[PDB]
Amino acid sequence: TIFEERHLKYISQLGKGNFGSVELCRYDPLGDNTGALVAVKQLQHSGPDQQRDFQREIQILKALHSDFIVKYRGVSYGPGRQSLRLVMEYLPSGCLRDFLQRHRARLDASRLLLYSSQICKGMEYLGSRRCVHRDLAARNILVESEAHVKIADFGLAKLLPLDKDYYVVREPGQSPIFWYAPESLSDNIFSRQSDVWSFGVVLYELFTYCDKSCSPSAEFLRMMGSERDVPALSRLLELLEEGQRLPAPPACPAEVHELMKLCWAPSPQDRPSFSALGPQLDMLW
């Protein structure tokens, strides 16, 4: 729960989220290379605002206890106060984006639906804690095992106040635009309902086994086209407002495609809840 910095032996970089990376370290207090492997998150950039974002992330993940959410291990203690690190569990399989591509051939529709059902359960639990993820994508999901997935990357996660159902992010966005809901794209309005939009994109990613040629970017870029003096985001928004949607992935079962269409409902209120999606996915298997 408190990891001494001197005992955290650096191995390699796992990911590069902006303002701070995630590294693979071994917790080696005996110094003999026999200790357990862990994932350590730290800020790289500096400008007290990101430090408050990092402390928020820690507090958020610390108060989360689900089989479908990446496990918090503790924090790091060293010759500080620069800069404190978030210690989490390491999932040797890595992100589901890479796993889907490495094992296309062995993952059938029931397995994809099992992952979908699990991501869903984890999203239900995030909603129940008033947490909005803002970064649901296959790249931010980890494989614990052949039949077990977990949600991760809580760097953009915000807690909803008790009086509100949405969060208006002042920023704006620095993630690929193909996962955002139309209301986040136009007014930066994030909520549980915008996480449901993104979930439909995660359903699309799973059922295209994260193939790069029919990926959310690749397919939206082809159906968007090339305008004269209109920015890419505005064109995507014109496309979504017109009711155009990503098209059903090759060999995708009809039921799953209809489910993605529900997740992509134009207005947030018409999008099903994660608790509504849950039994639907279980029924399909």
Ligand X SMILES: C[C@]1(F)CCC[C@H]1Nc1c(C(N)=O)cnn2cccc12
Residue 17 assigned ligand-binding role: yes
Using CB under 6 A as the binding rule, whether residue 201 contacts ligand X is answered as no
Using CB under 6 A as the binding rule, whether residue 214 contacts ligand X is answered as no
| 122 vs 268 by CB, closer to ligand X | 122
Measured from the CB of residue 115, what is the shortest distance to ligand X in angstroms? 15
DSSP assignment of 122-142, as one string? Answer: HHHHHHHTTEE-S--SGGGEE
Site for ligand X in 135-174 (CB under 6 A): 140, 142, 152-153
Q: Of the listed pieces 76-84, 88-96, 115-123, 190-198, which binds ligand X according to CB under 6 A?
A: 88-96
Using CB under 6 A as the binding rule, whether residue 91 contacts ligand X is answered as yes
Helices 192-207 and 216-224 cross at an angle (nearest 10°) of: 100
Burial 43-59 (b: 16+ CB within 10 A, else e): beeeeeebbebbeebbe
Considering only 35, 94, 173, 278, the residue that binds ligand X (CB under 6 A) is 94
Residue 16 assigned ligand-binding role: yes
Compute the Cα dihedral for 2, 11, 174, 189 and give only its sign: negative
- Could you check whether the bond before residue 267 is cis, i.e. omega within 30 degrees of 0? no
Residues assigned a catalytic role = 135
Pairwise CA distance, residues 95 & 56, whole Å: 23
Considering only 5, 9, 14, 177, the residue that binds ligand X (CB under 6 A) is 14
Pairwise CA distance, residues 217 & 220, whole Å: 5
Which residue ranges are tagged as binding site?
Answer: 14-22, 41
* Footprint of ligand X (CB under 6 A): 14-15, 22, 39, 70, 88, 90-91, 94-95, 140, 142, 152-153
